[PDB]
Paper text:
Kelch repeat and BTB domain-containing protein 4 (KBTBD4) is the substrate receptor of a cullin3-dependent E3 ligase complex (CRL3KBTBD4). Recurrent indel mutations in the Kelch domain of the KBTBD4 E3 ligase rewire epigenetic programs for stemness in medulloblastoma by recruiting LSD1-CoREST-HDAC1/2 complexes as neo-substrates for ubiquitination and degradation. UM171, an investigational drug for haematopoietic stem cell transplantation, was found to degrade LSD1-CoREST-HDAC1/2 complexes in a wild-type KBTBD4-dependent manner, suggesting a potential common mode of action. The mutant and drug-induced complexes adopt similar structural assemblies requiring both Kelch domains in the KBTBD4 dimer for each HDAC2 interaction.
To determine the structure of the lower affinity KBTBD4WT complex mediated by UM171, we used the BS3 crosslinker to stabilise the binding of the CoREST1NT2-HDAC2 neo-substrate. This sample yielded 2:2 and 2:1 KBTBD4WT-UM171-HDAC2 complexes at 2.9 Å and 3.1 Å, respectively. A subset of the 2:1 complexes showed additional density of lower quality for a CoREST1NT2 fragment wrapping around HDAC2 at 3.3 Å. No such density was found in the 2:2 complex, likely due to steric constraints that would prevent CoREST1 binding in this higher order assembly. The additional binding of CoREST1, however, appears to enforce an asymmetric 2:1:1 assembly due to steric constraints. Steric constraints also predict that the KBTBD4 dimer can accommodate only one HDAC1/2-CoREST pair, as observed in our 2:1:1 complex. The asymmetric 2:1 and 2:1:1 models allowed comparison of the equivalent KBTBD4WT site 1 in both the bound and unbound states. Interestingly, UM171 was only observed in the HDAC2-bound site 1 and not in the second Kelch domain, suggesting that UM171 binding requires both proteins to be present. UM171 is buried in the site 1 interfaces where it forms contacts with blades II and III from the KBTBD4WT Kelch domain, as well as with the HDAC2 catalytic pocket. The methyl tetrazole inserts into the HDAC2 catalytic pocket to form extensive interactions, including a hydrogen bond with HDAC2 Y304 and π–π interactions with HDAC2 F151, F206 and H179.
Residue numbers in the entry:
A (entry chain D): 106 to 116, 132 to 160, 163 to 187, 225 to 227, 231 to 241
B (entry chain B): 13 to 128, 130 to 380
C (entry chain A): 12 to 76, 83 to 214, 224 to 246, 251 to 458, 465 to 484, 488 to 504, 508 to 518
D (entry chain C): 11 to 77, 83 to 214, 224 to 233, 236 to 246, 252 to 255, 257 to 263, 265 to 267, 270 to 290, ...
The structure:
Amino acid sequence: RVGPQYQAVVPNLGMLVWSPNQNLSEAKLDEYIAIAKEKHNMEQALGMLFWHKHNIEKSLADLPNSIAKFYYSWKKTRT
Amino acid sequence: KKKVCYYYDGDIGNYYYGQGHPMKPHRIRMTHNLLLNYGLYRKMEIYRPHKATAEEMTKYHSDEYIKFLRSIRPDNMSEYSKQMQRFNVGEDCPVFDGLFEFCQLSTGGSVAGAVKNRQQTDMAVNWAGGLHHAKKSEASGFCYVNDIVLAILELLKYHQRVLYIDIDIHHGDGVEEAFYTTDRVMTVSFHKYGEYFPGTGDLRDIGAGKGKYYAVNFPMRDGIDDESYGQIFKPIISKVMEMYQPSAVVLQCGADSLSGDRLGCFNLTVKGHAKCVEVVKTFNLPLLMLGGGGYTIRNVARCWTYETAVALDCEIPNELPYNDYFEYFGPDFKLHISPSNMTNQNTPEYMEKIKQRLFENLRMLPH
Amino acid sequence: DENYFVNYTFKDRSHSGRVAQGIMKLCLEEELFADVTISVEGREFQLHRLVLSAQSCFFRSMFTSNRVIVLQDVSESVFQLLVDYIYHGTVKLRAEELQEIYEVSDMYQLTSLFEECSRFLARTVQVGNCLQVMWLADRHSDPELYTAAKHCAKTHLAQLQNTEEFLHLPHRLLTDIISDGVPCSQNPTEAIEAWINAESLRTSLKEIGENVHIYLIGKEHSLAVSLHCAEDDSISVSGQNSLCHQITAACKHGGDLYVVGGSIPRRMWKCNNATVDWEWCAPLPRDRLQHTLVSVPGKDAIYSLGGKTLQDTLSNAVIYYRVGDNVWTETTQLEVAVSGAAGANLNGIIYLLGGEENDLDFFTKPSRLIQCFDTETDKCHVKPYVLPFAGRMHAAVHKDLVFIVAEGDSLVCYNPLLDSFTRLCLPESLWKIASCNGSIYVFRDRYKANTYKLDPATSAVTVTRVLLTNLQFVLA
Amino acid sequence: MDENYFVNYTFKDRSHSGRVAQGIMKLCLEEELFADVTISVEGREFQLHRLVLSAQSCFFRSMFTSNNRVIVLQDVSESVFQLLVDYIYHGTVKLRAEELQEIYEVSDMYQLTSLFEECSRFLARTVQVGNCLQVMWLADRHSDPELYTAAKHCAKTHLAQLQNTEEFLHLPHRLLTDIISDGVPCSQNPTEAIEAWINAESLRTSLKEENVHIYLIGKESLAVLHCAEDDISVQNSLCHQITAACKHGGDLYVVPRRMWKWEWCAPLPRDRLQHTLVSVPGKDAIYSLGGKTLQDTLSNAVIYYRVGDNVWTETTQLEVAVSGAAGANLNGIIYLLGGEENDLDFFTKPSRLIQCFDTETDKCHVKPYVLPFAGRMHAAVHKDLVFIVAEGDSLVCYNPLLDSFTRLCLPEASLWKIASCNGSIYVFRDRYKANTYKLDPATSAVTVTLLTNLQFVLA
Ligand SMILES: Cn1nnc(-c2ccc3c(c2)[nH]c2nc(Cc4ccccc4)nc(N[C@H]4CC[C@H](N)CC4)c23)n1
Ligand SMILES: [Zn+2]
């Protein structure tokens, strides 16, 4: 169909959850993530590190500080 | 060397389409989960999409349709009885809780990726979107809001020429119909034709009016292998780029083309599928990657993760990482998949004739 | 044929017919040029050497080897009808004298009447005379009749064990009967033990095992009940599996039930009747509905034919699915597109009947055409003749023929080889039919008597007796 | 019916006719048995069979019943009788122009209607002006309306040279009246031929009396022939594009829905290109078949065109859609040859198929036989058969009654353009650069007899 109304009429406000850190080393970041997981998820640790302006030491110091997953868990268990 | 911006909402896989519906949104989360366990998430910029407003979303769709989508609820369905029979909602597009919220979440990432047109990034990967069937008058297929059209329109604000490459098995008639008349957007779709779901894309149809020799459609038959797919895709995309010179390319990577798909008749591997991304990344142009048709979640997650990895220009081992969804993965537990031996009806003469016809059509494009 | 205007060869297509019409109108209407007198049981007949030699190779040898030829084995009536068949080409076979005409045609090397009589014997084989017809086929070395009789023996040995002829049977025939089939439900061990009153039979006895042969998909939470025709003219129930989906097309291949349906119907499910765990098959690669599914055990395939598209356009597409390879592959397209046409498999040939043919004025008229597709050569063609009724109908292959039941109480018995029908009236709504064991079962569309058991002989229908309000599919 | 296949039914053997025919063919000529009769013809002895001889011929049956020894005929040649016996037994005989009148007379005397009509058609297709009167007398003596009409047509169109031929002078008035009944053209001077006679008033009264029969559309546009004298003579221009054209009794109709004759006619009810057009006079209508739709898709529609009433009427659709085929008209049956057929569901391929359309019963069918060469072809109906030519310089002849083709060589000299005139066949070449040729089908000899382009030729 030609769709004269259907045809398009031709003429960021985004929350940065995580960003890469050039200064931080990949091995250091992996070790920090593993330590956080052992002591206190990977996404949560990455967000905590990002909130600290990419400070591994500060993040480690502050580390101890119908409806919407639940349905998919039952399917995974049944598998 | 390329700034990759990844868009994904945490609570986007909680929009189940009801029992028995092939469209599983949670597959997107699955992909994200793998991106967390493979380790590529650190290298990519992760953003949180914002719910697009109805006024911003209705830039393409009619106001009445947007109001209908907003007002539709599973409980308030008896009153909305004559509205569902004219908007193709209820049978092909099931009504589930938070439909408008899911539409906003899908549209937000696609719009934000296109917005960041600002020359602030190089690649924008949003697996939440990719809906290419929502027509202006009413919804179609499994889509409700055509976020691809909105993203293309947003890109049209700054960029002059926009190329939309679709590799999903379905034709994506919505995108072609949206930009059928206008010559600002050139859409090239490699789809399956012949008593299939779209039934619209064909070699004999091109954009009407000023869109002549723009809407390039490539009919295919079932069981096309990866080697022929690449040997067809590369020359036609090279000719299109040489003759059209798009400012930006909106690459949509549907997951139906993979082998073993529930609603797909093609026979392709992960490399055969995501070699088009490798080919298009060599043109050194701003690029947008979107999701789309995917119904084999195990294969969809692997394909999307491999596509994101090749967008990052990195390499990952075939051994899948021990993710939360590692349970229902295949007994090999490997990333790549071996194509199943299926007869290929795409004879070389047929593909050669179609390629020659499309080259002749592109030769008539003004330059 | 170098030049039509100078010299060329002329071929008359009707010549073969012209000679054919010149014999019956002469050698029978007004007996002339009669050179031979043949007497059978003191009955003289005036026959010509040329026609008999041309038709039969047995009389030609006698002629070339003579006042009157005298025969003893052939009676007067059988000889008269055989002579009428030889001179005219048409004869009315009767079951009362079928054995005599069969053996005479076998002796006289008349292959055309020998093959037809062999198929007649294989069509009307019953448990009462299965052993006798098996022995007759063994004497005359008839493969098809012998294997049909062996099938009947292996499927009814349970009652044949006390038929007074099983005991007085040669060891070779017993070994051949026990070679295959003979499900354990018939208790072959007792029959083998009683046969002696003994090593080859014991070491060669394969038990196939009884399997469900009737499936009823109904109740619209749709239910898929199973039936097992056992005892004598009785039906039992041995399964109430429910897929809890919307099945829109199904086909029975072997002892497994394959169904297609659900929301956005493209998937496929399989039930082996031994468990409630459905197996997943390759999804249908086409978006079609009202497409017929036919199971071909000879190629071990499932053919989906016809069906409408999402654009309200008929599709003449044929796709076969391999049971082993689990792959769908396209094949030769149909001559004319149909939707809802009844599909029946017969010795590897698929017959599509009726449906909804595309009318000239963009409509779907009720079709009556018969189109046959040959699986071996992958070719299809439309039969010149048409069915008496047009519309939706259910077709079931029994023996060597097809029973078709349409709207109303009409029941034809179309035979593909003879290109002829046979009208039959059901007792006084679209009925459905199935072929279980060696009889025909008829189920009404809606019941609130429901099952009628009938056989083609004597056109006798008897009421026979889980309950399903709706019966949308029946598979045999 | 009322016959249960499991109880009682009648079996019909469709191979009985073939069986008996093969038995007669094999057990009589290859090995002679049960002859029981001898036939003497000019000393030659034949061991025939009374049953076979009297089967398809009542002449022998009429005399065999009405009174066994040797029988001698009166006027039958040995070779003629041998070939007659072969035709009676084998069913396939090789007809030759040498013994053509004798076999025709014998088959007329004998009871062989198929051979009689075959010889009648043979005489009709081989009639010449020199021996036209002999064929006319032969047809008049026997019962053969078709040969009589063919001889009348041959004599009427060549009555100019029949004024003094030593046969027209001695021709009886009974045949002369029938010959002059037809519309002999005034260009042949019928008055002088009638006045020649033997050297009355009713014969002079029954003297009802040339028109252009060849039209060439070329130059991309000019539409220009009259075959006169012995073995052509000549400029209307329309300057209009033409996708199809036809000739209906000297009316050059040219076709998109515009119609011209330069007289406007009723518009086409459908827009098609490269559609075959024929002028079947049996139903007095012009038929359009095949073609390509405006949407670059092959068409499958057929529409009538009555000359008396310009009402284009639809009819039954063709089984197979073709475009650019060759259309031939023969006794009310339309033959579509070759063309462009659908391939790969998206393109067109050369096709060599025969589409037979019965206008009287409004039916369509496809013949199993295929043309020797596919592609674009041009066909012309000379005399109860169709000559087809195309690029390659290899002419073919197809007789619809028989299941056979005949190849013929052509000068190498561009797609050819064949015609069909009353005199002989004319073949043209698209590239002028060759020129007009005339070929005799019997001798296969072509002799030579301005538009740069020749896109359409109509005869
Ligand atoms: C991107 N994408 N992925 N999957 C699909 C998709 C979406 C929908 C369908 C589909 C595939 N296959 C289908 N087959 C049938 C069966 C059928 C065939 C021929 C004639 C009649 C029925 N009906 C379908 N829907 C109807 C549409 C009209 C409405 N009134 C009721 C539901 C669909 N799109
Ligand atoms: Zn899709």
